[PDB]
Amino acid sequence: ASPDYLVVLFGITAGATGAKLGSDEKELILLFWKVVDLANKKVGQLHEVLVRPDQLELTEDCKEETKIDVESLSSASQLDQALRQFNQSVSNELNIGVGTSFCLCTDGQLHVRQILHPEASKKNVLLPECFYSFFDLRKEFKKCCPGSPDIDKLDVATMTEYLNFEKSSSVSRYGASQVEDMGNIILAMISEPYNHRFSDPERVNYKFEDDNTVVRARGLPWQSSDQDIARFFKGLNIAKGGAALCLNAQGRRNGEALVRFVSEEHRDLALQRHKHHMGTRYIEVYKATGEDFLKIA
């Protein structure tokens, strides 16, 4: 909350980008970042770390759009070591030991909520604490910038255009260009005439105890618990008491779960996990109506 620094973070998977980031369950392969000194209105240099996936398979779309060379990827660290390297780098660059604070900042919701938390969960990686909070730069931009496009229309390109900057994708590779542009967006919003303050970030729920916010998951293995479905949705914020395993007419578990999220935003993110995996099993994710959750829990 009210950090000294932002860490602009941008992830690239072995598959789809943009609005479909994370929808295909492809692994993280490349992470870009840059720090922003808020009080001093300065940015640091661009960083990157390659992340070797368990499955060295890039979609043709990924290859065309990102131009990542698989050779260097095949020599790289996997997620656990890469995120430790990211954490150590940030802490050293910001001299965190003297007591200064930072918060992640991302282009929308999918980088932290749809990529990092579900992937870390599946690989039993313990994410560093900074991954449990972030500013969605699009939402911050909206609060800051009058006459801007609706939140559903915002992205880095729209945001740079609004502010009269040129997009650096004409000269920079995918990922790197977005982080460089986000850096310039942030400097603009914290300066005149906007003078934005970054206050309390969004949170990623880690504990576990209206129609448009509920999903029905189907296909849970007989051994599944409350806690397993919560982990399947790691990265999203389930409402308090908002996850229950369903029973059939005879009181046996029926392989379904009803999950109420805090927002239609998160419900939509959960729908994009349809046929993602719990172990080797597909978990189906459907819309549900709120009357059924009442009865359930």
Swiss-Prot record:
Induction notes from the record: Down-regulated during the epithelial-to-mesenchymal transition (EMT).
Result, substituting L247V: In DFNB109; hypomorphic mutation affecting alternative splicing in patient-derived induced pluripotent stem cells and other cell-based assays
Location in or out of the cell: Nucleus
Transmembrane segments: none
Main location: nucleus
Function: mRNA splicing factor that regulates the formation of epithelial cell-specific isoforms. Specifically regulates the expression of FGFR2-IIIb, an epithelial cell-specific isoform of FGFR2. Also regulates the splicing of CD44, CTNND1, ENAH, 3 transcripts that undergo changes in splicing during the epithelial-to-mesenchymal transition (EMT). Acts by directly binding specific sequences in mRNAs. Binds the GU-rich sequence motifs in the ISE/ISS-3, a cis-element regulatory region present in the mRNA of FGFR2.
Disease implicated: Deafness, autosomal recessive, 109: A form of non-syndromic, sensorineural deafness characterized by bilateral, congenital, severe to profound hearing loss. Sensorineural deafness results from damage to the neural receptors of the inner ear, the nerve pathways to the brain, or the area of the brain that receives sound information. DFNB109 affected individuals additionally exhibit vestibular dysplasia, although they do not manifest problems with balance or movement.
Protein name per its UniProtKB record: Epithelial splicing regulatory protein 1
Residue window of the full protein shown: 3 to 309 of 681
